[PDB]
Design a protein around this ligand. Sequence first.
Ligand SMILES: *C(=O)OCCS[C@H](C)c1cc2c(cc1[N+](=O)[O-])OCO2
Ligand SMILES: *C(=O)OCCS[C@H](C)c1cc2c(cc1[N+](=O)[O-])OCO2
Lengths: 277, 277
Amino acid sequence: AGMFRALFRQAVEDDRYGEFLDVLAEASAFRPQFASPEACSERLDPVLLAGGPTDEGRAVLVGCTGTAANGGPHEFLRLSTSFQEERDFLAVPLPGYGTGTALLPADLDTALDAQARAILRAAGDAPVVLLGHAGGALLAHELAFRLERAHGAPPAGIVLVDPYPPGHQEPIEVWSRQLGEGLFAGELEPMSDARLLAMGRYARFLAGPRPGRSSAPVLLVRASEPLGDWQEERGDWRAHWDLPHTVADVPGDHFTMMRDHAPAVAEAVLSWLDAIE
Amino acid sequence: AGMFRALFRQAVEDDRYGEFLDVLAEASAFRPQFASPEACSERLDPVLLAGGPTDEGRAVLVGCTGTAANGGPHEFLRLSTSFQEERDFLAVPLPGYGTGTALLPADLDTALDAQARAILRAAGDAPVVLLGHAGGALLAHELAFRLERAHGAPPAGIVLVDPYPPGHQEPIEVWSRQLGEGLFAGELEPMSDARLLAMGRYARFLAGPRPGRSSAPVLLVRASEPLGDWQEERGDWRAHWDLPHTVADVPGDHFTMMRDHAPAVAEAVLSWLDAIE
Ligand SMILES: *C(=O)OCCS[C@H](C)c1cc2c(cc1[N+](=O)[O-])OCO2
Ligand SMILES: *C(=O)OCCS[C@H](C)c1cc2c(cc1[N+](=O)[O-])OCO2
């Protein structure tokens, strides 16, 4: 495929995953942007991946697509089967990843506002519970806060699957080559250069200062196996979030928790949703 | 073509040529490199573009290819016709631009050493006079110093056609937009991403600290037209070199001095070579 992918493959080989994401972020600034939610390229209409039973007033689940350049409307396919006849599961796309190619968001708030609009239109009057994995976990929380402060509509809950927020990212740096190697392993087709630029841009968004904590209760789902070696004397390698409502540990590692062990994640979410309703 | 080209086009549209060259330099570090002159991809054999008359001991002219990503073995075609029946003119390629694609030089000295080997093999025992335009002007002098100090073979002269060395580059930054538009206008084909990366890497080499002046006499050739608008209170907009042996002004601007007015450049060179011989 493209040169950015080739360069990225080399950087992951050289254990410089982080340095090249910075290049991707810098480079992405020259892509055409949208500065208002109105100006967004894509239809962010959420895709219905599971239907719950027939009713009322039950929360619907919204999957917030992660940052991975190999990602897309297939992240939640395996997870969603476990919600069939249990909950509606809607997957909302991340602006900048579609198809010309898609405009990039001018800042993260403009992307969130475009998602907030499509989510409120699709969910109707049902309460919404936001779910995201890894980078998507961080996006799920920023979308939660945006819905609350800017659209006056806080979600009923947030599910954070293996989040590594700023200040708790030491494991994610020690294992960066495993993380970089994971992106290339997950390729169904080659990662496009446009999507790699989108990924770098969003990675930079999420490293920035985003004060503002959602009111919504948090289910923290954590992998149980480390992704790489780790001396326990360094402290905890696990995913972290401040003051969760509930913590669930599931089999697998950062990656496999969402593949081979997706049902374990779904079971933790379903038990948690009943508890808070 | 490729995404680096797409981004670069947007950058010159947005008048951010300089910022995007910095991106190209950063991305170029993730390209395959050669760390010793032996390991060089290309043959670098100079191409004979003009023949002088039959002799002995007259200098041959060596054209040092510039950094332009749209460049190649055609930079000196129009200029060289004016040396036919006057001087041998050899055009030596710049390492990193050929064909797989070509390895990038790990530093500038490795590229210069690879060129030094091919030039000495080609020039035989004739004295050598290096010629370069703009960025190539800077490369010719770094090559002159390299030939003298590293290969014990100082050239007989250097011809610097419109050089803007560090510390005298203010006019060429103000006109960076015209430089970028010139690159795209000059495209015989689309600039490949590999060559844009090479161009960025060489630009970075040539901004860095390179003390050390060649012993060889310098003919400084200067355009007479500004490339763009210019407030005279900013000073002299013209190309600069410290303590030139001879200064020649020719019609045209930074660009057209080598196109429509190449014969005036050649006439300045031919008189100069006779004086110093
Ligand atoms: C999930 O892994 O995100 C996909 C991009 S991987 C990147 C190194 C990463 C990993 C984690 C978080 C963010 C993030 N990122 O986009 O920078 O958070 C949680 O774990
Ligand atoms: C000649 O114009 O070189 C073509 C590439 S433009 C690049 C920014 C540049 C422009 C000039 C000089 C060097 C140079 N460079 O750093 O490569 O010098 C003269 O004008």
